[PDB]
Amino acid sequence: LYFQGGSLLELQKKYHLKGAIGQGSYGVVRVAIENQTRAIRAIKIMNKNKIRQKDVERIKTEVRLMKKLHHPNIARLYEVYEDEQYICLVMELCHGGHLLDKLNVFIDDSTGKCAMDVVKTQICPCPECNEEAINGSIFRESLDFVQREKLISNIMRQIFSALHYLHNQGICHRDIKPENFLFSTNKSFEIKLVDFGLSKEFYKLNNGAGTPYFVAPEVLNTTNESYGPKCDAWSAGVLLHLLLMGAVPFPGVNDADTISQVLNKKLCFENPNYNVLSPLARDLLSNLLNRNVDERFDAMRALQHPWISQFSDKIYKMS
Ligand SMILES: Nc1ncnc2c1ncn2[C@@H]1O[C@H](COP(=O)(O)OP(=O)(O)NP(=O)(O)O)[C@@H](O)[C@H]1O
Numbered sequence: 001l002y003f004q005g006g007s008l009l010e011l012q013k014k015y016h017l018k019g020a021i022g023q024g025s026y027g028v029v030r031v032a033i034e035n036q037t038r039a040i041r042a043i044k045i046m047n048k049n050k051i052r053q054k055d056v057e058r059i060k061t062e063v064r065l066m067k068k069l070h071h072p073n074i075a076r077l078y079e080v081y082e083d084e085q086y087i088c089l090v091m092e093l094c095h096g097g098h099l100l101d102k103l104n105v106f107i108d109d110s111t112g113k114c115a116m117d118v119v120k121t122q123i124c125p126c127p128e129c130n131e132e133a134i135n136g137s138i139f140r141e142s143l144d145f146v147q148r149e150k151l152i153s154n155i156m157r158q159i160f161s162a163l164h165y166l167h168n169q170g171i172c173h174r175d176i177k178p179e180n181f182l183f184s185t186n187k188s189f190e191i192k193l194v195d196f197g198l199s200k201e202f203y204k205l206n207n208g209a210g211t212p213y214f215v216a217p218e219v220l221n222t223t224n225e226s227y228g229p230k231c232d233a234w235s236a237g238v239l240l241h242l243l244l245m246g247a248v249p250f251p252g253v254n255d256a257d258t259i260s261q262v263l264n265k266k267l268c269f270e271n272p273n274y275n276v277l278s279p280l281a282r283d284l285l286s287n288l289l290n291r292n293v294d295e296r297f298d299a300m301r302a303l304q305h306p307w308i309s310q311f312s313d314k315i316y317k318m319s
């Protein structure tokens, strides 16, 4: 666990450490102010001793990848600092909380339809969030059918943008799920992918999983790593289904039950329940949650699909 990082003495000179914005398995993530720029960062602190007591390879991979990636929907990793006991990762700070922190998705009992509320989250202790909170006024905003599809489509555009980029960089993510996306702020719906712990470069697959709800059947049905990045497109489809329908398509009582449903369940988007979706949403869902890998969309095809693209590629300015 050596990352060729700077010294922690340098870290404490360069950054002013503030309050926690999360806790991982190996330490906290703290807001930090870069002294010379006033940039507000997240510093992820990981205890090397606790790591060693498997995740070592995953961590080196996550760090090496996030450091080299440059995309507006992927959290940047700027700098690494370390000593014998700690790794400190200076990254882009997301103030808005997890996808499902801000988006409240549930089935409305009276109509049987999925409902969505947007929540103003109170997670970040940074100076900017502090300032806005004490000067401002607050809640839960309910979204109609049109608002929901527009917002969800926008979310999916960002997820597929990130995936297209990743796949073209030759990286399979393998853990696309709501928890791994954070909102940049409370002021917009910009999202960032913040976790690469299970990621692998294509050229290393088979060189010697994910959260069950979101894992593709071909991943579950393969002894080794003989599968492609369309596994990520499937995971994104599962995320989309949850956002649109209020529940995952394979809602097992436990992991074993979930794995069986993913493997056995042929999704039929001609079940009358999907009448609640626009024809385009229905069609995008069916093309992401296609068990036939050859036929399933990749990120590019998802991006070109009219549910995502229909307000783009215009000629005359009609606004
Ligand atoms: N760039 C960031 N900006 C803001 N918050 C972050 C950032 N990165 C991580 N966090 C928060 O820190 C928490 C822990 O990070 P995480 O990457 O989950 O560590 P972990 O040990 O992998 N825990 P888990 O993923 O649950 O097994 C996350 O839930 C985020 O809410």
Ligand SMILES: [Mg+2]
Residues within 6 Å of the ligand: 024, 194, 195, 197
């Ligand atoms: Mg993580």
Ligand SMILES: [Zn+2]
Residues within 6 Å of the ligand: 095, 124, 125, 126, 127, 128, 129, 130
């Ligand atoms: Zn903040």
